[PDB]
Design a protein around this ligand. Structure first.
Ligand code: CO
Ligand code: CO
Ligand code: CO
Ligand code: CO
Ligand code: CO
Ligand code: CO
Lengths: 276, 276, 275
């Protein structure tokens, strides 16, 4: 048995382009009221069907995110609307691959934002792997009863109700081997409090770095590096992009970005196949 | 549950181009000794993982075909050499999809030539679907202990020893529905004594006709139609190509040829995915 | 100016080794050395200050003990809390004619069962806690841990009651809350993040509320004697040294977390207050 890697399409989000690429079109004396753009980008997840056990990188958005009775706050829904047909929901993408959520051994939470941790609550047999400081930060938003923003109260509530098995990656812990050719990369603070990536070595495809929101897009990645409009730790963000570039070169790996529309079009998706 | 169709690469064969396209390069006064060429073409099989049960179309060549102790006769090996790495063997292609031979419900033997019926002996639980006249003709070769040619004595011997569950399609029987969107096409005599094809209707991809050796290649298909060298029933061969064209037009189906190098290159193979 | 009250919130018992590590080691003459089950006070301190009332610690929740109690049964068997109704914090404050709604700041020295038990009462105050203590306690909650020093049911109630939190940052110290009231950040030691309070009273002078940064006079020494089970042993020692330094530089008295003999000497809220 050999691994197969799947890219699952979990719909699309839109938002002010400045969130993705800070100051992408600044006002000038000639164009003082420069309008921004409302860009569309993909939300996706990666399943590695590995002989040692199934590994899921990220979990997309909860199906109960949007709408008047949705878990996401109304301002959040207005600034980051998520559009997804039933087929796009992670539970349906998995069902079409005949993969039971009960058979997922590990889930890597790159971070705990609304569009990456939305379906953690499905995976009650998995070890949920997360950066310790990201876990702390998200839990504080919950304890403070925050109803708006990128950390979703109702999602966190469900994680606790469902008694998930958590494994926290310590801030000083890196290059954590989970299975043959599967290694967690600890990027630390930058985009959020604590970012994790994944390096996957496939027999045929070779090396892949799942960067998630440590690098939103090829435009972010550069050079030159272009940071996002809201950033927790700007210096850490730059260091993390530099680290990813270094690992990519040393290991001859492709870097898969968090939300790059053009790159995502190129992926073979789970409705067509997989990477071996 | 939805069907997934897989194209499995079972290696390459070479042979005189005149076998594929009769009289492709006739001698002339200026070129009286016109040399032929030794072309290479693919051997492949198709698995339809259908919710009603797995269906296999053709079975490629037996792994014990070639070599001094192989089942194929010496002269046959010299004229139709098959080259295949271990990974190309059908049992290995199926195992990499986690499909056991015992899981196959139907095998369609398009005909009983060495490169389509080579692995029937693996499928001891399946119903083996074959044209009655093709079955009769192959069995007579066996009874005559024929050691050379396209019908392999050792393969046939193994089918009998393994007591396969044959269903013969009668010469006047056509359009045999096996499962939702899976229909057997009876082309009758032409390339061989009795040729079967399959029409597959997939939700997304639409209609596919699996022609096997009723149409070797796009060059065979034309227009103009170009018949193969060595042909059992030349009138039936033409009738069958015209039947395939008619069905393809009426159902808006793509025709997948038996041995077309360029078409085969375009297929998504089982190492990369499937058609839905 | 301000009045300071010491409120008696009952008594707890536990293995002495929890308080003083290796207090009575086995020897060849005494290979099966027995320990003892010591008793100590749980208490809280109210400072009635003109700029707003400040409460240091909150004792145990009235619903802690019993078959239906919030504390886990192993926890109740190892750290049993005994308290009459009049010992409950809500009753101690009622006797002082202080409304819980009138507490401006509550200082959570840390989030252990016997200090954070009644945070949920104070839905109008700012609850002040070390950021790393808050994080740690919240992780135990998210993991649904029902035994130990961090009480799942208490935490559940802080969240359900929508308390107003102010986290003291890891590198933040000497935080003036009011004239003569300063938060002392001791950091990691006994727990993930310990806070103390320096109180300057007009007549009594300086008081340092150490809570569990220093359990007792025997802990404080010299020589310093650390507790059994300790988060950060180096930090624990550094914090005791810090307290000794501040006490000497400010001429302040150090009030320990759980010292039976010291607690007996305090003027209790039922008799009067400090000025
Ligand atoms: Co993000
Ligand atoms: Co994102
Ligand atoms: Co043939
Ligand atoms: Co053939
Ligand atoms: Co304590
Ligand atoms: Co204590």
């Amino acid at each position: 048995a050999q691994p197969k890697l799947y890219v699952m399409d979990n719909g699309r989000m839109r938002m002010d382009k400045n969130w993705m690429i800070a100051m992408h079109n600044p006002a000038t004396i000639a164009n003082p009221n420069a309008p921004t753009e409302f860009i569309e980008f993909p939300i996706y997840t990666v399943l590695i069907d590995h002989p040692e056990g199934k590994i899921l990188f990220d979990t997309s958005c909860n199906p109960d995110s949007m709408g008047a009775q949705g878990r996401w706050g109304e301002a959040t829904q207005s600034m980051f609307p998520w559009t997804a047909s039933e087929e796009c929901y992670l539970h349906n993408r998995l069902e079409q691959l005949k993969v039971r959520p009960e058979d997922i051994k590990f889930v890597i939470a790159s971070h705990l934002h609304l569009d990456h941790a939305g379906c953690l609550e499905m995976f009650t047999n998995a070890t949920i792997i997360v950066h310790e400081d990201e876990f702390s930060g998200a839990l504080q938003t919950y304890a403070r009863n925050q109803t708006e923003g990128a950390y979703i109260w109702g999602d966190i509530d469900a994680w606790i109700k469902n008694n998930l098995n958590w494994r926290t990656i310590k801030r000083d812990e890196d290059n954590i081997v989970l299975a043959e050719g599967i290694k967690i990369l600890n990027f630390g603070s930058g985009h959020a409090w604590g970012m994790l990536g994944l390096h996957v070595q496939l027999p045929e495809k070779g090396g892949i770095i799942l960067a998630s929101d440590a690098v939103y897009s090829a435009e972010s990645y550069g050079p030159p590096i272009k940071p996002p409009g809201i950033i927790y730790d700007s210096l850490g963000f730059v260091r993390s992009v530099e680290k990813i570039k270094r690992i990519a070169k040393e290991t001859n790996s492709e870097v898969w970005f968090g939300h790059d529309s053009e790159q995502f079009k190129r992926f073979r998706k789970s409705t067509e196949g997989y990477y071996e």
